[PDB]
């Protein structure tokens, strides 16, 4: 039944709403009053609509990933998907933290905001971590990357680190990985690096790298980065897309090479 | 026009993939409906079912529901590599029950007289390691990585041929659950020895893992924490396990208390320590 129960948290958190889906039979079963407000769209559209086609295509995968009836907790662990928006374009970042019940899959959707918008993140806490393979592919990214660069974990996980760098700084990475190979585990500071924010705009970071030697193989297993936002961008709307290109595969392949030497 | 192949061109080309390899078939699915536009001759053979109850099926519906999520994840139109000009997943596929396949998805244009983009999939059956071609005993190893809260953060693909689990089965799940109830309290001690040492490895056989099938397989394990550079705490544990004895049941893929919530939190608490 329900409905009051969504009108639960939102008076303390303005940015959230709720949604129940039948899975994987029916779809949109229920939804809070304020999904309309948040998604700027009258619930005349919260029809018997496929919840999945409110998501963006990149996010559908991770969504179905997390919402397996099997691995779900009971109402009484989260992912980020972009949600339209109105039939497109027009998308919004939400944290979805899902659960299981039966109605007469329930998830809390909290909308995500820039670090560069009121409420701003203290510039001294604009920090985020990243982990990447020796082949120079993102193995992991901190949730803090989203409000600071505009990217959900899925956008980077598996993508080439180098592609998210400003080309002028892409040559810098070999030296950096050379010093990582030295020190063999020890972190070193090295400023600055520009990352491309999802809005196309560049944002300068103060960086630190360490990298982890595999205890058995003595080869480097992955590289750690701790970055601090030096300068905020103009366009604080990092979340929304805009709409020498192989320095990348080239330079990646050099680092990977360099990284294959064991260090004892 | 080269970018777009035909069904006949596909039936031929795949009968070459499934020539130097017998555990593979191909499937193209429409991006519009997820319907199977072309399945290749080997599928019926591998899936022990007629090619009748095929074409027009929503390929997703042939998967196990748990594998469905990792499928849609990697068959994203935008992240897919184009065929013949690449990052796979593992899904169990319904037969006549399920079988394990490595799925390597691609994009391409398929005709059947106007041309339509489709997801093309290379499906290769996964086999036991305790089966011809057996994995040599001294190479029967897999690596694991888990968080200080004791959740699998990563597992090696060797896990599948040795215990029956695809990566999705373990990622995010409780390490201690895949262990024998009796060897669970053992982890405490292991996590102290890790906390005795900033991450140098230490051998400690034996530990028993459940095998999805659901048999116990004794492992010779070793462990090593990764001291987080900037935290000086242990950021995650590493295990390197070798199969001590093979299970009697070679077919580990096919399936048959709350000490678990407790010990984990205990172990996690431990790892809060600054080290030493």
Cα distances (Å, whole numbers) of residue B196 to B184, B191, B203, B225: 19, 8, 14, 10
Q: Based on the structure, what is the number of domains in chain A?
A: 2
User: Which residues of chain A make contact with B149, given a CB cutoff of 8 A?
Assistant: none
- Give B267 to chain A, closest Cα distance, Å: 20
* Cα B161 to Cα B253: distance, rounded to the nearest angstrom: 8
Kindly determine whether residue B200 and residue A210, on different chains, have CB atoms separated by under 8 Å.
no
Candidate from B69, B87, B173 with C-beta closest to A65: B69
* Cα B24 to Cα A226: distance, rounded to the nearest angstrom: 43
Considering the domain architecture, whether residues B122 and B137 belong to the same structural domain is answered as no
Name the residue among A91, A222, A88 with its Cα closest to residue A155.
A91
- Write down the residue that tokens 């599948």 correspond to: B160
Minimum CA–CA partner of B240 in chain A: A216
SS (H, E, C) chain B: CCCEECHHHHHHHHHHHCCCCCCEEEEEEECCCCEEEEECCHHHHHCCCCCCCCCCCEHHHHECHHHHHHHHHHCCCCCCCECCCCCCEEEEECCCCCEEEEEEEEEEEECCCCCEEEEEEEEEECCCCCCCCCCCHHHCEEEEEECCCCEEEEECCCHHHHHCCCHHHHCCCEHHHHECHHHHHHHHHHHHHHCCCCCCCEECCCEEEECCCCCEEEEECEEEEEECCCCCCEEEEEEEEEECCCCCCCCCCCCCCCHHHHHHHHHHHHHHCCCC
Kindly determine whether residue B87 and residue A158, on different chains, have CB atoms separated by under 8 Å.
yes
User: Which residues of chain A make contact with B71, given a CB cutoff of 8 A?
Assistant: 61
Q: What is the CB neighbour count within 10 angstroms for residue A202?
A: 15
Minimum CA–CA partner of B229 in chain A: A187
* Cα A136 to Cα A151: distance, rounded to the nearest angstrom: 18
Which of the listed residues A77, A112, A147 is the one where a domain comes to its end? A112
B74 Cβ neighbours under 8 A, 6+ residues apart = A61, B80, B87, B88, B89, B103, B105
Which of the listed residues A51, A85, A112 is the one where a domain comes to its end? A112
3-state secondary structure of A145: helix
Which of the listed residues A112, A147, A172 is the one where a domain comes to its end? A112
Considering the domain architecture, whether residues A8 and A30 belong to the same structural domain is answered as yes
| CATH value at residue A53 | 3.30.450.20
* Cα A64 to Cα B64: distance, rounded to the nearest angstrom: 13
Owning domain of residue A89: 1-112
Resolution for this model in angstroms, one decimal place? 2.8
Considering the domain architecture, whether residues B99 and B1 belong to the same structural domain is answered as yes
- Among B62, B64, B73, pick the best mutation site for testing chain A contact (most A Cβ within 10 A): B73
Minimum CA–CA partner of A61 in chain B: B73
Considering the domain architecture, whether residues B141 and B255 belong to the same structural domain is answered as yes
User: Which residues of chain A make contact with B72, given a CB cutoff of 8 A?
Assistant: 60-61, 64-65
- Among B64, B76, B143, B152, pick the best mutation site for testing chain A contact (most A Cβ within 10 A): B76
Report the DSSP beta bridge partners of residue A130.
Answer: A141, A225
Q: What is the CB neighbour count within 10 angstroms for residue A144?
A: 17
Inter-residue contact B155 to B142 (CB < 8 Å) = yes
Enumerate long-range contacts of A187-190, CB under 8 Å, 24 or more apart: A187/A224, A187/A226, A187/B229, A187/B230
Candidate from A58, A66, A215 with C-beta closest to B76: A58
Considering the domain architecture, whether residues B201 and B246 belong to the same structural domain is answered as yes
Kindly determine whether residue B69 and residue A70, on different chains, have CB atoms separated by under 8 Å.
no
Minimum CA–CA partner of A224 in chain B: B229
Considering the domain architecture, whether residues B64 and B99 belong to the same structural domain is answered as yes
- Among A53, A61, A79, pick the best mutation site for testing chain B contact (most B Cβ within 10 A): A61
B35 Cβ neighbours under 8 A, 6+ residues apart = B29, B56, B57, B58, B59
- Write down the residue that tokens 């294959």 correspond to: A260
A197 Cβ neighbours under 8 A, 6+ residues apart = A149, A150, A203, A233, A235, A238
Please count the residues of chain A.
264
Read off the DSSP letter of residue A49: -
Considering the domain architecture, whether residues B35 and B169 belong to the same structural domain is answered as no
Kindly determine whether residue A62 and residue B73, on different chains, have CB atoms separated by under 8 Å.
yes
Considering the domain architecture, whether residues A150 and A174 belong to the same structural domain is answered as yes
Enumerate long-range contacts of A43-46, CB under 8 Å, 24 or more apart: A45/A86, A45/A87
Considering the domain architecture, whether residues B116 and B8 belong to the same structural domain is answered as yes
User: Which residues of chain B make contact with A96, given a CB cutoff of 8 A?
Assistant: none
Minimum CA–CA partner of B151 in chain A: A77
Strand (E) or helix (H) holding A205: strand A202-209
Pairing of strands B24-30, B116-125: antiparallel
Name the residue among B124, B118, B58 with its Cα closest to residue B91.
B124
Inter-residue contact B138 to A36 (CB < 8 Å) = no
Read off the DSSP letter of residue A160: B
Considering the domain architecture, whether residues B177 and B141 belong to the same structural domain is answered as yes
- Give A72 to chain B, closest Cα distance, Å: 11
Strand (E) or helix (H) holding A153: helix A153-156
Inter-residue contact B54 to B27 (CB < 8 Å) = no
Token representation of residue A36: 């309309």
Considering the domain architecture, whether residues B50 and B163 belong to the same structural domain is answered as no
Considering the domain architecture, whether residues A65 and A54 belong to the same structural domain is answered as yes
- Give A224 to chain B, closest Cα distance, Å: 9
Minimum CA–CA partner of B75 in chain A: A61
* Cα B41 to Cα B27: distance, rounded to the nearest angstrom: 10
């Amino acid at each position: 039944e329900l409905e009051h129960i969504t009108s639960e948290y939102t008076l303390r958190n303005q940015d959230t709403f709720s949604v129940a889906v039948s899975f994987l039979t029916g779809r949109i079963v229920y939804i809070s009053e304020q999904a309309g407000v948040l998604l700027r769209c009258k619930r005349d559209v919260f029809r018997g609509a496929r919840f999945s086609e409110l998501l963006a295509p990149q996010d559908v995968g991770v969504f179905y990933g997390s919402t397996t009836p099997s691995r779900l907790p009971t109402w009484g662990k989260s992912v980020f998907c972009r949600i339209r928006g109105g039939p497109d374009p027009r998308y919004q970042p939400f944290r979805l933290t899902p659960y299981v019940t039966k109605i007469r899959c329930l998830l809390i959707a909290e909308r995500i905001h820039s670090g560069y918008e009121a409420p701003r993140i203290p510039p001294d806490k604009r920090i985020f971590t990243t982990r990447h393979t020796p082949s120079c592919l993102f193995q992991d990214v901190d949730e803090r990357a989203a409000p600071l660069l505009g990217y959900l974990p899925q956008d980077l996980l598996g993508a080439p680190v180098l592609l998210f760098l400003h080309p002028e700084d892409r040559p810098l990475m070999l030296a950096i990985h050379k010093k990582i190979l030295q020190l063999a585990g020890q972190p070193f500071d090295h400023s600055p690096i520009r990352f491309c924010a999802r809005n196309g705009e560049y944002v300068t970071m103060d960086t630190s790298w360490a990298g982890f030697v595999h205890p058995w193989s003595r080869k480097v297993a992955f590289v750690l980065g701790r970055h601090k936002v030096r300068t905020a961008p103009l366009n604080e709307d990092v979340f929304t897309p805009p709409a020498l290109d192989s320095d990348i595969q080239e330079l990646s392949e050099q680092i990977h090479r360099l990284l294959l030497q064991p260090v004892h």
